Design an enzyme around this catalytic site. Structure first.
Site, PDB file in Angstrom:
ATOM      1  N   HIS A  41       0.834  -1.237   0.000  1.00 60.06           N
ATOM      2  CA  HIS A  41       0.000   0.000   0.000  1.00 60.06           C
ATOM      3  C   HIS A  41       0.860   1.275   0.000  1.00 60.06           C
ATOM      4  O   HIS A  41       0.269   2.365  -0.172  1.00 60.06           O
ATOM      5  CB  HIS A  41      -1.050  -0.023   1.117  1.00 60.06           C
ATOM      6  CG  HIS A  41      -0.558   0.295   2.489  1.00 60.06           C
ATOM      7  ND1 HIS A  41      -0.765  -0.569   3.570  1.00 60.06           N
ATOM      8  CD2 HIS A  41       0.107   1.370   2.972  1.00 60.06           C
ATOM      9  CE1 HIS A  41      -0.227  -0.042   4.646  1.00 60.06           C
ATOM     10  NE2 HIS A  41       0.346   1.143   4.299  1.00 60.06           N
ATOM     11  N   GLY A 143       3.017   6.934  10.568  1.00 61.89           N
ATOM     12  CA  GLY A 143       4.133   6.389   9.764  1.00 61.89           C
ATOM     13  C   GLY A 143       4.757   5.169  10.425  1.00 61.89           C
ATOM     14  O   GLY A 143       5.934   4.863  10.104  1.00 61.89           O
ATOM     15  N   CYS A 145       3.715   2.201   9.920  1.00 65.43           N
ATOM     16  CA  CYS A 145       3.500   1.114   8.927  1.00 65.43           C
ATOM     17  C   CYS A 145       4.813   0.446   8.522  1.00 65.43           C
ATOM     18  O   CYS A 145       5.790   1.164   8.279  1.00 65.43           O
ATOM     19  CB  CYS A 145       2.876   1.654   7.652  1.00 65.43           C
ATOM     20  SG  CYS A 145       1.094   1.837   7.796  1.00 65.43           S
TER      21      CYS A 145
END
Ligand SMILES: [Cl-]
Lengths: 302, 302
Positions: A41, A143, A145
């Site tokens: 993603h 952030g 991820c």
């Protein structure tokens, strides 16, 4: 006495964390040999995330649309490819800090450490459990991820989780390092139900053993129960059913304390039915389920 | 929503941990440049610990009575010397993994990470607070000694704690990296009173801000209070008095949430007087005091 939630030392994982940027999106990547792993993603715009065709989005992208930093070192992406929900970015340089590692898919109710990262720089380390509903109750800001979960076994870092999504209900979901989601979740910004969580019964009993070993004994009572009797009470309080495998796994803790597993279940039963009556166990006022029997053995034996 | 106890990444500290053996005693040491730091009580026999004269015990010891391993690498002790309660073992080799570091003496109510070690090998990392009574509620088993507490600020590891003693009352005490005990404690196996602990009021308020930011708002009420009114209630519930410095330190959290510090004190007051009425805040049923305002800012902003 003394018993805390303990993460694995994070040094072996710190030297593998990089920064991956695509467009306005920067998140974290895991640099093992010549491959950086991150959530696919990263290639999505806020708009794309709503209904992404990752095949068609990945085709439009070129190597040079991927900006991969390790501290300073701009790493050159020499290829890009998709395994389920993980992007593999091939780079020119093999990480000279690559530890001995395996990729494993853990079971629900198992624990792991997360090295929480922002723009490819480690911020913190904490101990998590895979919930029975395949979510993670964690700390992942915007952030966070591509941050990874792991265990250390002998000399080997066993990578088991990569962070992908916060669900609108404020829980976390992610994949194994082959890109297969834990649970029914997809990497799409839609409504997604986690469904009913339960309490990890075998973990709560592990933690009651931890409490006895560290001097906390008020909740020991003069009763046993059968697995059937117990599981009837478990099901009412959204506890996972206890199996003979669970009883087998608690054996060493049973042996250390001289308290039979079904004796401890009889304790757990009473705690579920009458609560704690305003007392605490290992400084907690609720029953803890994020220590495995293995975690309790490790911490109560080095 | 999502807020967990987070330790600093431990990699910079892992490459500094060694194994120190004297006689039947092996514990942990901290190898910075050409110096291994450990508790001076490594030189004591079970017998000596009862009433040690460390001057006379250190004189009988020779370099070669100190066995210092780093993984394999037997390190050669070329000198030995005493700074307050820490032994400095001079060795032939300067640690090539020596991070940028300072030695700091922290205040009561400040937090730090502990890299928990057994025989000079890292086992785990966890977040601690210096209690107001200068103890540590931790996990230190029988060879956990000489394990260190630290913070990471910009690029610098700030070493603030070395583990020395478990007290007969099952709490922990230790020193700064210059060997000065935190609190009234001595490195002697005698009875030693910690004295009255209090709850770190400024930390509880920091954590209530953390709870508001992560969606948990049930305990916000329509009241303010003065610092005087509050501190009268604090003193009854063994909370640390709140100073204007405390109010100043909570300012940014106040600004983020639009809740005035004295407004939050009025919330805290009601929670102290009526309890939680069987509810939870950030999944806890008691008031947490081991997050500083700085910890909450770091975790709620990266
Ligand atoms: Cl609790």
């Amino acid at each position: 006495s003394g018993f805390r939630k303990m993460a694995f030392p994070s040094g072996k994982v710190e030297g593998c964390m990089v920064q991956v940027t695509c467009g306005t999106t920067t998140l974290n990547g895991l640099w093992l040999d010549d491959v950086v792993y991150c959530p696919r993603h990263v290639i999505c715009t806020s708009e794309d995330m709503l209904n992404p065709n990752y095949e068609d989005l990945l085709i439009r992208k070129s190597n040079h649309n991927f900006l991969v930093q390790a501290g300073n070192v701009q790493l050159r992406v020499i290829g890009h490819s998709m395994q389920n929900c993980v992007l593999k970015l091939k780079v020119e340089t093999a990480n000279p800090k690559t530890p001995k590692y395996k990729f494993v898919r853990i079971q629900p109710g198992q624990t792991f450490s997360v090295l929480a990262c922002y723009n490819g720089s480690p911020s913190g380390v904490y101990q998590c459990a895979m919930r029975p509903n395949f979510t993670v109750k964690g700390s992942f800001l915007n952030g966070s991820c591509g941050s990874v979960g792991f265990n250390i076994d002998y000399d080997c870092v066993s990578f088991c989780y990569m962070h992908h999504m916060e669900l609108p209900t404020g829980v976390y979901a992610g994949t194994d390092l082959e890109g297969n989601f834990y649970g029914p979740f997809v990497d799409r910004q839609t409504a997604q139900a986690a469904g009913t969580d339960t309490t990890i019964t075998v973990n709560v009993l592990a933690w009651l053993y931890a409490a006895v070993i560290n001097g906390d004994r008020w909740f020991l009572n003069r009763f046993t129960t059968t697995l059937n009797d117990f599981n009837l009470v478990a099901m009412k309080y959204n506890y996972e059913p206890l199996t003979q495998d669970h009883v087998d796994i608690l054996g060493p803790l049973s042996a250390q304390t001289g308290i039979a597993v079904l004796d401890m279940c009889a304790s757990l039963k009473e705690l579920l039915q009458n609560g704690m009556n305003g007392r605490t166990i290992l400084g907690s006022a609720l029953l803890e389920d994020e220590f495995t029997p293995f975690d309790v053995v490790r911490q109560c034996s080095g």
